[PDB]
Ligand binder design. Structure first.
Ligand SMILES: CCCCCCCCCCCCCCC(=O)OC[C@H](COP(=O)(O)OCCN)OC(=O)CCCCCCCCCCCCCC
Ligand SMILES: CCCCCCCCCCCCCCC(=O)OC[C@H](COP(=O)(O)OCCN)OC(=O)CCCCCCCCCCCCCC
Ligand SMILES: CCCCCCCCCCCCCCC(=O)OC[C@H](COP(=O)(O)OCCN)OC(=O)CCCCCCCCCCCCCC
Ligand SMILES: CCCCCCCCCCCCCCC(=O)OC[C@H](COP(=O)(O)OCCN)OC(=O)CCCCCCCCCCCCCC
Ligand SMILES: CC(C)CCC[C@@H](C)[C@H]1CC[C@H]2[C@@H]3CC=C4C[C@@H](OC(=O)CCC(=O)O)CC[C@]4(C)[C@H]3CC[C@]12C
Ligand SMILES: CC(C)CCC[C@@H](C)[C@H]1CC[C@H]2[C@@H]3CC=C4C[C@@H](OC(=O)CCC(=O)O)CC[C@]4(C)[C@H]3CC[C@]12C
Ligand SMILES: CC(C)CCC[C@@H](C)[C@H]1CC[C@H]2[C@@H]3CC=C4C[C@@H](OC(=O)CCC(=O)O)CC[C@]4(C)[C@H]3CC[C@]12C
Ligand SMILES: CC(C)CCC[C@@H](C)[C@H]1CC[C@H]2[C@@H]3CC=C4C[C@@H](OC(=O)CCC(=O)O)CC[C@]4(C)[C@H]3CC[C@]12C
Ligand SMILES: CCCCCCCCCCCCCCCCCCOC[C@@H](O)COP(=O)(O)OCC[N+](C)(C)C
Ligand SMILES: CC1(C)C[C@@H](CN2CCC(F)(CNC(=O)c3cc(Cl)cc(Cl)c3)CC2)CCO1
Ligand SMILES: CC(=O)N[C@@H]1[C@@H](O)[C@H](O)[C@@H](CO)O[C@H]1O
Ligand SMILES: CC(=O)N[C@@H]1[C@@H](O)[C@H](O)[C@@H](CO)O[C@H]1O
Ligand SMILES: [Ca+2]
Length: 1056
């Protein structure tokens, strides 16, 4: 019975059968239970429970009263409750949700999965230190947010009560709401605040009703059907968690910038650094560390000739585009006819030399033979085989030993990744059917729905890639309850911050296992570099003051122009003195013998050319524009003057060498999938734009209805457009909307139809999985190489003294603060007056208790001894600080009111410093933080290079996208009043959003759209420079952040 191993196979067979039974559930066709298909299924479910209820009885009898056995018991008891409770209509369907745990039974049956899970479960206990840091981040930022912005997102511009009453009119809506309704609320700034958006910024009517919306008072709903708000700690954590995932964090920021103050970007800039970057990556570091702790034919010319033939044929395949001329199509087919014949000629020649048996011996020779038959088949069969022509690129593996070796390493990586992938599909499947039960037919139908297994699996994969996962959250919260946020918190936590970081650990562990003399003296002078470095810094200020809105006749413009001449002359002399002392190139130690000196040569050379063009009253405007762009690279001279920056830059360029092959393989997949996308999707990315297009089906009907026939910004018309779209897909920002366009594509001059071809999910989901795999071997490649580099390198006082030294006092304080932590989370918007008094009294008790602690501490140790320890100093600061906060509160109560209310609010917010006491107790957390501190010298310079990169691009963006405008005639999708390149200050903030990758594809869209005919000073080739601007910044920015993570990882490993 139980001894025989085949019994387990029988149990496994039933398990797989139970999984398919769950996957056939239809959310809102089986709830009625009136169909015959449901009737057979429920019987089929009942039969399966009988087996498992039977089996558990046999096993219990055989073995009597193993964690997995306990889980199996829990499923039986829970389902028995569901089964036995039948006949009671009170929450019968709700009890039906526990059956989603049945597939977990498969973990124990598969030995490989059981081992991996067991290893995973033994790594969790050491993640508590990271969890405590998560509590500090959420709790500190969760109360500061509530204290500042509690109830400020309800604000709306209302009509005056006297106005409506006296004039006896009630046709107007009570408060301004744009015609989209509550989906895009207009949040105003209260009179006592200084938010950016005021009720006087309301656009006029388009005699005027809008001008009478001139009262900003609290409304009756928060943004997104109440989902986004800070009215209490519960709703503040939903907002903070969404910011940590870097999805829609700007939208939350803009809401409080419009209502409270522009300087709220400080709150979100710190959160994205402390929480989104360091906290969410310290999880990766801890897991990875802990896992490690647990005759003519053979001629060279012939091979080169064949290699060239394949390469040229591949290039030809990528020259197709929409509206292709007929002659070009004919030429390509003739080219295909020739190339396949050439391979056929090679196919025959090799057969003769080695014979039929000899040719079969070579494995690559077998693959080539498979290609010739299909190539000839296509001609003789004269379109599905056309898509198979892309396989010819695989022939190049024969002649690339470096890539051939690399591909072998990646292929062998699948043996270790196979077990994990099986664990990810089970994880997704359980959450897919769980979602169906909760959000079944409740999303009234949105494309991101849980109405069926196919579209429930896709919506769970989309959430885990963090693309519009908040849009689903709002629908989930509104439909069922605000507590539905727990579904997304668990799905995003166990999936991205546990399972994904386990995959990286699997890979890492697998791999791991006379005048000239004067010049010579002046340049060699110690302070020469620092003197020059000061001039460069002053030159950065001049660059950062440039902006489009500078009036040419103003004094600022002349000042900027004059300084440019001064700095140009200064740096010419500095270059001139160096060359005289060292010589241009003739000498061995000549000036141009080092790249850094060469870099300064070009920067000086372009400056001289700029002067000449400026000297020239001629048609040279185009040249002046290019020069203005290259004059933003001047800050690059800082690297050679700072030894710390020079070393790190040379280190990053070194890290690119080990992963060079993977990059080349990654760039080869972009072209392969880019060419494939063009063939499938060229010319099909057009749609009819208008208020109502349910009738439109073709281009002509769109013109007849006086609507506009437009094209998607990200399409696959040609390999140029296909590569730009694939990069956006790979970045996982806006990747869903490109998928929707592919599914809806119908044909040339045809209106797309929703979910026309669901089979295209394979093209897009496959790309996002393959690319994520490569970009995971780049991170591992950097880590492994770094590890290689690192290895090679009085009686009344005595009782008081006993108490203070005793741990009793410390643990008592930890209890009081934990109570204070609870009390501080009691506050919410519009709390009852009784609560205000109760919380005020609770503050009194804490104040005196802390005061006694300081008094006892002073007596036990003495004034000089007590002040020595830094912890005691921290106590004194808060106790002194706490007294100041309470003192002002009582004066505010008192008749005198000289205290500005901002002071009282700031004091209340700053009283959260009491939580810092607990940091003393958490020895484990402190040691984790010490790891980052030990890594600061390496991470400090990488932060300097991050800011230098920001400065160059922030100043460059202003030059490029400075004059782009947003208007109802030319609407913008990513830019707004908050995200603009108008000046250096705003371009700096916009680039921070781009680095986080929040709707950065929307910003690029706004630069690709054609300018208005009437508008002037519009750069004709801007759509060509924009993709280069955003691609290079995204890749350069992400490479630096990866190295910061590797730097901390190494310090952790070498400390344990
Ligand atoms: C340490 C934190 C780390 C994880 C944080 C991740 C995000 C957690 C979000 C989960 C909680 C979701 C509930 C949010 C909430 O407050 O709303 C519930 C309720 C409103 O929903 P009704 O459908 O009842 O609407 C009633 C309309 N009149 O809000 C309330 O009115 C009070 C709910 C309790 C307040 C929150 C206290 C507990 C803390 C949050 C719970 C999650 C803990 C996360 C570990
Ligand atoms: C691994 C995942 C573990 C967590 C599970 C996530 C899902 C949590 C449950 C979410 C849905 C629960 C409520 C279901 C529902 O429909 O409730 C009805 C009621 C009113 O909402 P109407 O749908 O009628 O409104 C539609 C408007 N026409 O919902 C509530 O507000 C009741 C909330 C009760 C909370 C029960 C679960 C949490 C209990 C506390 C946990 C701590
Ligand atoms: C790389 C080498 C090629 C491997 C992929 C072969 C795909 C073959 C494409 C054939 C084709 O055109 O149809 C594909 C089909 C679209 O259906 P209709 O042609 O009926 O559409 C209406 C016609 N106007 O959709 C698919 O099955 C696409 C699958 C693409 C492969 C994705 C995975 C690649 C690994
Ligand atoms: C100087 C260095 C310049 C050369 C850089 C070459 C190496 C490229 C490394 C890029 C990288 O690792 O970035 C990954 C980054 C992380 O994305 P998430 O998964 O966090 O998504 C969060 C939501 N947006 O993702 C990217 O930006 C992917 C870029 C494309 C990957 C392929 C690039 C290979 C080069 C061609
Ligand atoms: C460690 C902490 C998180 C646990 C203990 C804190 C709770 C006891 C606090 C946190 C937030 C408080 C809530 C914040 C807001 C509200 C809504 C308020 O008004 C409503 O019920 C209307 C809600 C709506 O309209 O959305 C009633 C009190 C209540 C439930 C508060 C009751 C006390 C709560 C649950
Ligand atoms: C990268 C390797 C593997 C293959 C080489 C790719 C090229 C064949 C691609 C890259 C850029 C592509 C071009 C990008 C843009 C255009 C413009 C497009 O429209 C026009 O010619 C504009 C006409 C006008 O403006 O009046 C026609 C296709 C073409 C030439 C594309 C043809 C195919 C090109 C040359
Ligand atoms: C180390 C480097 C980066 C130098 C330090 C940065 C400064 C040069 C930046 C940061 C803040 C910037 C300022 C932020 C805000 C404004 C207002 C803004 O004014 C307008 O565009 C006009 C407004 C109006 O007319 O109402 C743009 C210029 C200015 C002074 C910016 C000029 C450049 C400043 C001083
Ligand atoms: C291989 C992976 C890592 C991506 C690398 C970056 C690409 C996404 C970039 C590099 C060059 C870019 C192309 C450079 C120039 C053009 C021409 C541009 O068309 C025009 O010039 C029309 C505007 C005009 O009239 O000036 C359309 C975008 C495109 C194909 C760009 C698309 C995005 C490209 C392929
Ligand atoms: C990572 C490190 C941080 C990166 C991002 C730092 C960004 C800091 C500057 C972020 C932007 O701050 C500069 C402001 O001067 C903006 O200038 P504006 O003209 O738009 O408005 C000036 C007037 N108000 C609006 C202020 C009243
Ligand atoms: C390795 C890197 C370059 C990426 C960084 C990972 N980092 C945090 C988790 C994150 F990947 C979210 N996870 C997904 O998006 C995801 C995507 C796929 Cl295809 C499947 C699934 Cl299950 C999840 C976002 C970025 C970690 C250190 O640096
Ligand atoms: C035309 C109109 O509405 N005028 C009102 C005025 O009556 C009111 O006193 C003031 C403050 O609310 O705002 C404005
Ligand atoms: C439901 C609907 O709008 N049907 C219209 C029909 O009335 C009209 O005759 C036809 C040609 O314009 O287009 C469609
Ligand atoms: Ca996004």
């Amino acid at each position: 019975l139980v001894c025989n191993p085949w019994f387990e196979h029988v149990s496994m067979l039933v398990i797989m059968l139970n999984c398919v039974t769950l996957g056939m559930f239809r959310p809102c066709e089986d709830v009625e239970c009136g169909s015959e298909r449901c009737n057979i299924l429920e019987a089929f479910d009942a039969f399966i429970f009988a087996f498992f209820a039977v089996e558990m009885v046999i096993k219990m009898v055989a073995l009597g009263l193993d964690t997995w056995n306990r889980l199996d018991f829990f499923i039986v008891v829970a389902g028995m409750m569901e089964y036995s409770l039948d006949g009671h209509n009170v929450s019968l369907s709700a009890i039906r949700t526990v059956r989603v745990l049945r597939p977990l039974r498969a973990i124990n049956r598969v030995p490989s999965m059981r081992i991996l899970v067991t290893l995973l479960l033994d790594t969790l206990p050491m993640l508590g230190n990271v969890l405590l840091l998560c509590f500090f981040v959420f709790f500190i930022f969760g109360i500061v947010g509530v204290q500042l912005w509690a109830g400020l997102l309800r604000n709306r511009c209302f009509l005056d009560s006297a106005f409506v009453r006296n004039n006896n009119l009630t046709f107007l809506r009570p408060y301004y709401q744009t015609e989209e309704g509550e989906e895009n609320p207009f949040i105003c700034s209260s009179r006592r605040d200084n938010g950016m958006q005021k009720c006087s910024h309301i656009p006029g009517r388009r005699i005027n009703w809008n001008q009478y919306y001139n009262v900003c008072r609290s409304g009756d709903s928060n943004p997104h059907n109440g989902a986004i708000n800070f009215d209490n700690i519960g709703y503040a954590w939903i907002a903070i968690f969404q910011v940590i995932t870097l999805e829609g964090w700007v939208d939350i920021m803009y809401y409080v910038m419009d209502a409270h103050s522009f300087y709220n970007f400080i709150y979100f800039i710190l959160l994205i650094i402390v929480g989104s970057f360091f906290m969410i990556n310290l999880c990766l570091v801890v897991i990875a560390t802990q896992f490690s702790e647990t005759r003519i034919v053979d001629s060279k010319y012939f091979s080169r000739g064949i290699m060239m033939a394949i390469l040229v044929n591949t290039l030809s395949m990528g020259v197709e585009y929409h509206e292709q001329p007929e002659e070009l199509t004919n030429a390509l087919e003739i080219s295909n006819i020739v190339f396949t014949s050439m391979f056929a000629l090679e196919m025959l020649l090799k057969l003769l030399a080695c014979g039929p048996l000899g040719y079969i011996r070579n494995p690559y020779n077998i693959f080539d033979g498979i290609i010739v038959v299909i190539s000839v088949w296509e001609i003789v069969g004269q379109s599905v085989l056309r898509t198979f022509r892309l396989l010819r690129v695989l022939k190049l593996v024969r002649f690339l030993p470096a890539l051939r070796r690399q591909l072998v390493v990646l292929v062998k990586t699948m043996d270790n990744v196979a077990t994990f992938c099986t664990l990810l599909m089970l994880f997704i499947f359980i959450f897919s059917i769980l979602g169906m039960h909760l959000f079944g037919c409740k999303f009234s139908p949105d494309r991101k729905n849980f109405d069926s297994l196919l579209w429930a699996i896709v919506t769970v994969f989309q959430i885990l890639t963090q693309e519009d996962w908040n849009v689903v959250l709002y629908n989930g919260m509104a439909s069922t309850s605000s507590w539905a946020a727990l579904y997304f918190v668990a799905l995003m936590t166990f999936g991205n911050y546990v399972l994904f970081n386990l995959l990286v650990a699997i890979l890492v562990e697998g791999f791991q296992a006379r005048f000239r003399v004067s010049c010579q003296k002046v340049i060699t002078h110690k302070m020469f570099d620092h003197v020059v470095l000061v001039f460069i810094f002053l030159n950065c200020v001049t660059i950062a003051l440039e902006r489009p809105d500078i009036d040419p006749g103003s004094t600022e413009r002349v000042f900027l122009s004059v300084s440019n001449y001064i700095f140009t002359a200064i740096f010419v002399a500095e270059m001139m003195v160096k060359v005289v002392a060292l010589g241009l190139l003739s000498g061995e130690h000549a000036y141009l013998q080092s790249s850094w000196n060469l870099l300064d040569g070009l920067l000086v050379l372009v400056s001289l050319v700029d002067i000449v063009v400026a000297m020239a009253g001629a048609k040279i405007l185009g040249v002046l524009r290019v020069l203005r762009l290259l004059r933003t690279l001047r800050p690059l001279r800082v690297i050679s003057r700072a030894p710390g920056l020079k070393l790190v830059v040379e280190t990053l360029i070194s890290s690119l060498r080990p992963i060079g092959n993977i990059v080349l393989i990654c760039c080869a997949f972009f072209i392969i999938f880019g060419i494939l996308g063009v063939q499938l999707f060229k010319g099909k990315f057009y749609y009819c734009e208008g208020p109502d297009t349910r009738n439109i089906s073709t281009k002509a009907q769109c013109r007849a209805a006086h609507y506009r026939w437009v094209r998607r910004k990200y399409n696959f018309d040609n390999l140029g457009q296909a590569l730009m779209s694939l990069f956006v897909l790979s970045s996982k920002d806006g990747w869903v909307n490109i998928m929707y366009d592919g599914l809806d594509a119908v044909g040339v001059d045809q209106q797309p139809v929703q979910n026309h071809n669901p089979w295209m999910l394979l093209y897009f989901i496959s790309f996002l999985l393959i690319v994520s795999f490569f970009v995971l071997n780049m991170f591992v490649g950097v880590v492994v190489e770094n590890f290689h580099k690192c290895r090679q390198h009085s009686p009344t006082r005595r009782s008081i003294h006993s108490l203070c030294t005793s741990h009793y006092l410390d643990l008592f304080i930890t209890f009081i603060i934990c109570v204070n932590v609870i009390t501080m989370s009691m506050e919410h918007y519009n709390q009852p007056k009784s609560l205000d008094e109760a919380l005020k009294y609770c503050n009194y008790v804490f104040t005196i208790v802390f005061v006694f602690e300081a008094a006892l501490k002073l007596v036990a140790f003495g004034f000089r001894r007590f002040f020595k320890d830094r912890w005691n100093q921290l106590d004194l600061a808060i106790v002194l600080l706490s007294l100041m906060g309470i003192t002002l509160e009582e004066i505010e109560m008192s008749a005198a009111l000289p205290i500005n209310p901002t002071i009282i609010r700031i004091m209340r917010v700053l009283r959260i410093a009491r939580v810092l006491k607990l940091l003393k107790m958490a020895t484990g957390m402190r040691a984790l933080l010490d790891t980052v501190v030990q890594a600061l010298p390496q991470v400090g310079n990488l932060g300097l290079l991050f800011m230098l990169l920001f400065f160059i691009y922030a100043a460059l963006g202003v030059e490029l996208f400075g004059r782009l405008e947003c208007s109802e005639d030319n609407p913008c999708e990513g830019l707004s009043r908050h995200a603009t390149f108008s000046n250096f200050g705003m371009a700096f903030l916009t680039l921070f959003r781009v680095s986080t990758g929040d709707n950065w594809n929307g910003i690029m869209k706004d630069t690709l759209r054609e300018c208005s005919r009437e508008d002037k000073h519009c750069l004709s080739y801007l759509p060509a420079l924009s993709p280069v601007y955003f691609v290079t910044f995204v890749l350069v920015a992400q490479f630096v952040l990866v190295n910061v993570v590797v730097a901390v990882l190494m310090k952790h490993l070498e400390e344990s």
